[PDB]
Amino acid sequence: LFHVNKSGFPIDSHTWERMWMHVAKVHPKGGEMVGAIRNAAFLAKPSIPQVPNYRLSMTIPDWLQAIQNYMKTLQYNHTGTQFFEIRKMRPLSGLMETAKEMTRESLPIKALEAVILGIYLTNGQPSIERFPISFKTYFSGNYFHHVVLGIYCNGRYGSLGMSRRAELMDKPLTFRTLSDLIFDFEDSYKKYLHTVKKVKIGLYVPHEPHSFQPIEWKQLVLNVSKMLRADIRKELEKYARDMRMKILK
Amino acid sequence: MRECISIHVGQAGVQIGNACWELYCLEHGIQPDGQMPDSFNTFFSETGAGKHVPRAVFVDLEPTVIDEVRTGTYRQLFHPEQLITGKEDAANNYARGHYTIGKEIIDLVLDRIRKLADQCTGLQGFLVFHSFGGGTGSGFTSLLMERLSVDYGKKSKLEFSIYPAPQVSTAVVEPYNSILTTHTTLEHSDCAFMVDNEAIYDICRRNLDIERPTYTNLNRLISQIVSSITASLRFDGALNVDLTEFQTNLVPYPRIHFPLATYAPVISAEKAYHEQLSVAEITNACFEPANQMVKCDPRHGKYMACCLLYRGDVVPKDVNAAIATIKTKRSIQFVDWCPTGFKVGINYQPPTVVPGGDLAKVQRAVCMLSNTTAIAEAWARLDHKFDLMYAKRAFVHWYVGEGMEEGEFSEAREDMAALEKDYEEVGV
Amino acid sequence: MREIVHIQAGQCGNQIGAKFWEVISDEHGIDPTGSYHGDSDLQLERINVYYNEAAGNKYVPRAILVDLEPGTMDSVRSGPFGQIFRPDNFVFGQSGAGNNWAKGHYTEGAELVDSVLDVVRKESESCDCLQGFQLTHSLGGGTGSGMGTLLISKIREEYPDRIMNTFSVVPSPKVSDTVVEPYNATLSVHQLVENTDETYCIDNEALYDICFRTLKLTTPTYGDLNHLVSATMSGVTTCLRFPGQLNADLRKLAVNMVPFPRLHFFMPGFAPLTSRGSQQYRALTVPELTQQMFDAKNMMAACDPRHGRYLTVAAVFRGRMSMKEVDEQMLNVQNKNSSYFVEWIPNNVKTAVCDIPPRGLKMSATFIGNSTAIQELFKRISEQFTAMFRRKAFLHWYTGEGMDEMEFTEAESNMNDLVSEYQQYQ
Amino acid sequence: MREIVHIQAGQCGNQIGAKFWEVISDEHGIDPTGSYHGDSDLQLERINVYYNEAAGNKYVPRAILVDLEPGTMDSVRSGPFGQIFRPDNFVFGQSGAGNNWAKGHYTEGAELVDSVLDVVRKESESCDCLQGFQLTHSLGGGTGSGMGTLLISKIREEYPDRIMNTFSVVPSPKVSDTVVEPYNATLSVHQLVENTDETYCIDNEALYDICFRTLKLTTPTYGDLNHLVSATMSGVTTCLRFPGQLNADLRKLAVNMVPFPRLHFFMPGFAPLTSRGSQQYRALTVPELTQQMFDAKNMMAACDPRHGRYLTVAAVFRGRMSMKEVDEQMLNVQNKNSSYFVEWIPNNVKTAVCDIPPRGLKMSATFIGNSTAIQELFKRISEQFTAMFRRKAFLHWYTGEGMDEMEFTEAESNMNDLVSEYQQYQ
Ligand SMILES: Nc1nc2c(ncn2[C@@H]2O[C@H](COP(=O)(O)CP(=O)(O)OP(=O)(O)O)[C@@H](O)[C@H]2O)c(=O)[nH]1
Ligand SMILES: Nc1nc2c(ncn2[C@@H]2O[C@H](COP(=O)(O)CP(=O)(O)OP(=O)(O)O)[C@@H](O)[C@H]2O)c(=O)[nH]1
Ligand SMILES: Nc1nc2c(ncn2[C@@H]2O[C@H](COP(=O)(O)OP(=O)(O)OP(=O)(O)O)[C@@H](O)[C@H]2O)c(=O)[nH]1
Numbered sequence A: 001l002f003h004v005n006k007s008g009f010p011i012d013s014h015t016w017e018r019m020w021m022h023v024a025k026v027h028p029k030g031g032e033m034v035g036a037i038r039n040a041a042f043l044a045k046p047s048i049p050q051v052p053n054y055r056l057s058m059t060i061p062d063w064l065q066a067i068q069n070y071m072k073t074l075q076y077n078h079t080g081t082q083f084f085e086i087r088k089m090r091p092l093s094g095l096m097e098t099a100k101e102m103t104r105e106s107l108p109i110k111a112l113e114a115v116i117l118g119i120y121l122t123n124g125q126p127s128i129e130r131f132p133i134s135f136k137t138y139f140s141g142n143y144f145h146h147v148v149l150g151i152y153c154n155g156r157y158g159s160l161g162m163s164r165r166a167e168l169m170d171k172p173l174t175f176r177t178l179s180d181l182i183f184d185f186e187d188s189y190k191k192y193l194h195t196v197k198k199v200k201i202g203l204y205v206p207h208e209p210h211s212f213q214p215i216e217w218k219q220l221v222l223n224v225s226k227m228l229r230a231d232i233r234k235e236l237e238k239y240a241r242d243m244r245m246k247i248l249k
Numbered sequence B: 001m002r003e004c005i006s007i008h009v010g011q012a013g014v015q016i017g018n019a020c021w022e023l024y025c026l027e028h029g030i031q032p033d034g035q036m037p038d039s040f041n042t043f044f045s046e047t048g049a050g051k052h053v054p055r056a057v058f059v060d061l062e063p064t065v066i067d068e069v070r071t072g073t074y075r076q077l078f079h080p081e082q083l084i085t086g087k088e089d090a091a092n093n094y095a096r097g098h099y100t101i102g103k104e105i106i107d108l109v110l111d112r113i114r115k116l117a118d119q120c121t122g123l124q125g126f127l128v129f130h131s132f133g134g135g136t137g138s139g140f141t142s143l144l145m146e147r148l149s150v151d152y153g154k155k156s157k158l159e160f161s162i163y164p165a166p167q168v169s170t171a172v173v174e175p176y177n178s179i180l181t182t183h184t185t186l187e188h189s190d191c192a193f194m195v196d197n198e199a200i201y202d203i204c205r206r207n208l209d210i211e212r213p214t215y216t217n218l219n220r221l222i223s224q225i226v227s228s229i230t231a232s233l234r235f236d237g238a239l240n241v242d243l244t245e246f247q248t249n250l251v252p253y254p255r256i257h258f259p260l261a262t263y264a265p266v267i268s269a270e271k272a273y274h275e276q277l278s279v280a281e282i283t284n285a286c287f288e289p290a291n292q293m294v295k296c297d298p299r300h301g302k303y304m305a306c307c308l309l310y311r312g313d314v315v316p317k318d319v320n321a322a323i324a325t326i327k328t329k330r331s332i333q334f335v336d337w338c339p340t341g342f343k344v345g346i347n348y349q350p351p352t353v354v355p356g357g358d359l360a361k362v363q364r365a366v367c368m369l370s371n372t373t374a375i376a377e378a379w380a381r382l383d384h385k386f387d388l389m390y391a392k393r394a395f396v397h398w399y400v401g402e403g404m405e406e407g408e409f410s411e412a413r414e415d416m417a418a419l420e421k422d423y424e425e426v427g428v
Numbered sequence C, D: 001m002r003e004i005v006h007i008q009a010g011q012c013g014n015q016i017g018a019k020f021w022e023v024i025s026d027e028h029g030i031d032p033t034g035s036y037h038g039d040s041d042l043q044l045e046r047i048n049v050y051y052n053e054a055a056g057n058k059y060v061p062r063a064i065l066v067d068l069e070p071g072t073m074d075s076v077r078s079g080p081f082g083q084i085f086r087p088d089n090f091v092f093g094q095s096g097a098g099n100n101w102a103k104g105h106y107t108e109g110a111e112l113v114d115s116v117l118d119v120v121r122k123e124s125e126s127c128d129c130l131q132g133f134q135l136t137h138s139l140g141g142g143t144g145s146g147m148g149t150l151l152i153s154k155i156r157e158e159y160p161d162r163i164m165n166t167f168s169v170v171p172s173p174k175v176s177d178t179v180v181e182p183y184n185a186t187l188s189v190h191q192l193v194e195n196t197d198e199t200y201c202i203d204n205e206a207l208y209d210i211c212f213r214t215l216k217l218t219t220p221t222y223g224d225l226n227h228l229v230s231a232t233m234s235g236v237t238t239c240l241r242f243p244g245q246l247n248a249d250l251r252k253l254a255v256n257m258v259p260f261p262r263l264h265f266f267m268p269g270f271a272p273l274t275s276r277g278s279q280q281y282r283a284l285t286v287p288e289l290t291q292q293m294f295d296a297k298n299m300m301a302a303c304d305p306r307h308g309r310y311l312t313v314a315a316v317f318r319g320r321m322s323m324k325e326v327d328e329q330m331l332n333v334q335n336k337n338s339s340y341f342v343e344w345i346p347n348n349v350k351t352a353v354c355d356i357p358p359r360g361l362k363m364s365a366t367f368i369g370n371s372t373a374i375q376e377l378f379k380r381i382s383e384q385f386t387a388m389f390r391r392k393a394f395l396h397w398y399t400g401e402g403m404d405e406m407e408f409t410e411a412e413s414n415m416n417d418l419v420s421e422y423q424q425y426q
């Protein structure tokens, strides 16, 4: 499994050599390009993507699109080594500090820190409202998990996130219902012959950055595979109504 | 060990709770100030120096009725914090109670329910009192019932609602509120007990011969029924029926849990002299259509399951003879798949009489609960009322503007269509 | 908590407000000096709805008296129950509007409205849970019709969540003193529809008839009409101030009585009304009150409901009384008079009860009717407007202080719309 | 210990100081003969702050009086409470400054400065722990504007480590009784910025508005304005003399309210100010005091606080009152008015509470604000300055006293500099 940087910055010797051993092992050709990049005297300096700023004139779907293209520009991590250690139960303010230092450094990003970045970017807009979604799925005799960030601006459901695949990480605000969104995710997942087993939905995140409220991820959980989609849709629409009225607590 | 905590919501709930707690205080001997001059353990808690505090939580979004209780004759009984108030009522609006004004107060009451439940060694269940017509007693009870179901998933909740009457009404948007409350009272309850004001008015006009009754008489009768239900936990008798034994023998299918109560003998203090009041007579009186506390016709429906909770000077042989006589009647039509449908319980404690009430000092009484199918009609009329208003979308702008959406009306109506279909399905 | 700010504009507003405050003070047992001498404790625990406490156990009304002539203020402070008002709350101008809508809404009312808003704001933050406002004025004039419209327009912007009430005395067809009532009436009632919640229309001809036949008064004057209107004012809002078997506060009447958002033009009524000579010949019971309320000769708007069904009705009873009598009688009155009710409303009556009757009486009842027959008032007013607008008469006085010709047509179109909507359900 | 020296220059300063000494003596229970006839022991406990004991157990104020015209001393000694001052502390000139700044600072002001420094020095060695000095004067003149600045410059040369508290009366545009105010005003404030720690600007226009509108006075003489200013002055220095729940002397206010060294110009307030008629229609609670303090019509300098933010605020309450009330009030006052407060200072209110209120009240509160709206005044003065200096009007009189012309340009430059510095944080 992919390992996590924990020495702050810069990267310590142990994690450095561990990552290089990992990439040497997995890469079939292996040592040639690895050693070439190690002993490369000069390499092209990557540019710094500029953090976009909210503007009132331009519309909110284009805002979500803009954050999505910036995230795409940030070169999604497939090196197999996390660079910013995240804790689920940690209070929100620590995650805001993590998000702002991550934007300062602008390194490769995975799904969890991608949705944290999305929360950090969208925290400035009371009209926009966002929450997490998680899937636990089954394929090839092993279980895998994925996480994305849903949005409910202007009475419409949309999705942001990251993945090595293309269509599993970005949807627009064009969904009347949350059920249509999650079933679209299920169909895209089936397109790769991966079976979703369980689906989990949390809560709207508070709009105050400097707070200690933790992020909820398990407030709703279903076993999607066993049950027929009608009951799933009914329970999900009940839950969406319970959420947008702020009743759940 | 055998304890229940009662919750009173809205004006109707609080005003019935007044009569209920007066009745319990008279039953167990407690003075209005709490000082007695071990059956009390079900409802009361001793707090040293011989002071008994009720296990009650009075709630309302308006400090006008709870203020009357606070300054009334029972000011020294309830714990001062148990009485919980707001600032502005729900205003006959479901959405004001369930969404806007209710969310600022629910935590303060759930904390006290938790604090009360911690004091119980063994908790039996809840007793929620409310009314369907109101906005507090619909939205707030929906919110509270959802939260209690999430928190205490095992305990059984028994509602005692005041269903709107066919003719007499004191509000223009009762159908909307009732249809919205039905979802919570069907999903989260265990035994909803429906009541009408017209039926009890007629009962006092015929039997008690009170030509100009008011809400005090109605609340006293309802309180007498509630005291009859929970008699087996407090006192002792030949055949005892607690809440879970009570729920079984009455609920054949998980959704069919809407019985309707009855009581007998209700008579004036002067008419008792000429009347024998034997067991057979009160048993027959319980089954007549003129003593039902819902304006409904039991003759057009079959009794699925029945339960006769006796109390006072009774012995099982007369009860058996009475039930045998009842079962051979042709008007009393039972359902085929229930060859026996009579649960019996007996207590040695006869009924009590409040000093200011117009009821006779009887020697034996019976509370008759029935899961009959006639109550569908009592719902059907109300659905008709809904159909007249929702066609024009009348009064809907208040509900949508308060926060609620519009599809909730349609889905509540379809759920009532489903419920009536289910009630018609059985008894075929 | 649940306290109401009261505003008075024009001459009708000021006089009716003086009478209304006299009635409320009598109800709570308040001196004309501000002290308290009530016998019961139920007169104090809700005194904060209308009154503020002061040093020395005195109570000051939460009123705001406004006009463009110091004569009205002088008359108010000189009369009885005059010195209880806070001196700062009086707000006056130099010279009256002189019966000109433009003068009281664009030129002279506008300069002074800032002070009035400041006083309203100071009064409103001195209370915790503000229920809403209520205003008294006239439609046929400049100072009351015009400036009060501006005042409610601004207060609705600074307080979008609260509730507004306007007891506006409406022009009468026959009883007429001024010659430009239609213009001011139309211009103000353009705005009254869109910035209030409950408009209780009143008409002087109906009150004159009530004093003539029902009370047999020899020479009735404005004191008696103001007394009846103030009785209605006190009757509407009793459930906020006293305990009752079935309470009904202002938002409850609003939710029950307003089916569609624009249909909120009610007319009131009051019972029992009887002559002093014929006091002894009435049995004084609930059926008498119920019959008198629904009579055609008792409503305080010059209109016969026989040409229009009742969308909704509210009845606030007061006194120690039964609940079966009230509900059964409100059923018989609705069954026999089925032609005079709308069929797509199953229940048309909202009953509320308070346990405290008025001072002299021992049981009373306030009636509020949202009938569809009130369209005829606006019909005759629009007819008069059209007749005087064909000539374009009296119009330079309006255009000469910052007003345009088009606004008159806009208001007339709006009133055609409103009358069409009320007629749509008949 | 922590004693204060009080100096008075000019007719305006002398009269305000006389009223201030009358107020202070009344607060401490001192007879006008200098004897003590009070009741409590708290009065004697800190009497040494403003007084010196003398043989016979009398108390003499620690005050110095200066002017260039002997009439003011005659009026002061003749007037009430004028005998308490010892004669040797009076010093006078031959001929007044004639509203000439250069005369009161270069020509005849130098020939008398030695006596005032000598008596100030003699008074400063009559103590052990000196907190600072305080001076009353007017910027619109020659005897208070010039001699005053000369005096504070000399003293700040002598005692760099102490503090000064100049309660200067600034000249108003509309209420002007002099032709050459801008020249003197600018020439003085050139030197006030550097040689002073706290300057409280007072304006006659705002004071007159307070008397007319709030106190409802008919003919406000200078006595009433001097009484208001004296009340503010006594409010500022109350924590030095009486105990409280949260004390705050002069240096604590200086560190709390001076974010940057040059931004030390304040405008005070005071509450409760109530007319005689409206005495009984008020409750006298902490919310009332806090609302009256922050009212735009309660400021003692003719500026609109709405036209700028508050860098820092102080409020010295006076009376037996809860602390939760104060904390919640000065919290919600910031919450509602977030636009009027600076974002980069998380807390803007330095609250202090004393226990002994004024003699004729139960509660009081002296408000001191440091807003960016003060510079308004300076711009107006600058405008008047550049109106007259362009054509060199009245300027030969100042050059005839040996003053050069470039000093006017330098002072105007300092004026633009200070106004820009205040404008910066907005
Ligand atoms: N019940 C009452 N009706 C009144 C009273 N005074 C007037 N009315 C009626 O009001 C009508 C005109 O009202 P106003 O004179 O107050 C119009 P307003 O003063 O607000 O504007 P200006 O005339 O420009 O001052 C008049 O025709 C009368 O028939 C009153 O005291 N009581
Ligand atoms: N609140 C008060 N303001 C005053 C008082 N006296 C003056 N002022 C104002 O002071 C301004 C000028 O004050 P002064 O007469 O003291 C000028 P000064 O005497 O220092 O110079 P010379 O006249 O040359 O001696 C004048 O415009 C008045 O508007 C006062 O007693 N109280
Ligand atoms: N039997 C009986 N019914 C009552 C009593 N009080 C009120 N009701 C009924 O309650 C119905 C309306 O519900 P309310 O309790 O008044 O409304 P609410 O629950 O208080 O909610 P709000 O309107 O927001 O105050 C009416 O139709 C009454 O018939 C009572 O004391 N006894």
Ligand SMILES: [Mg+2]
Residues within 6 Å of the ligand: B010, B011, B062, B089, B136, C247
């Ligand atoms: Mg209520």
Ligand SMILES: [Mg+2]
Residues within 6 Å of the ligand: C010, C011, C069, C096, C097, C143
């Ligand atoms: Mg007038």
Ligand SMILES: [Mg+2]
Residues within 6 Å of the ligand: D010, D011, D069, D096, D097, D143
């Ligand atoms: Mg002078």
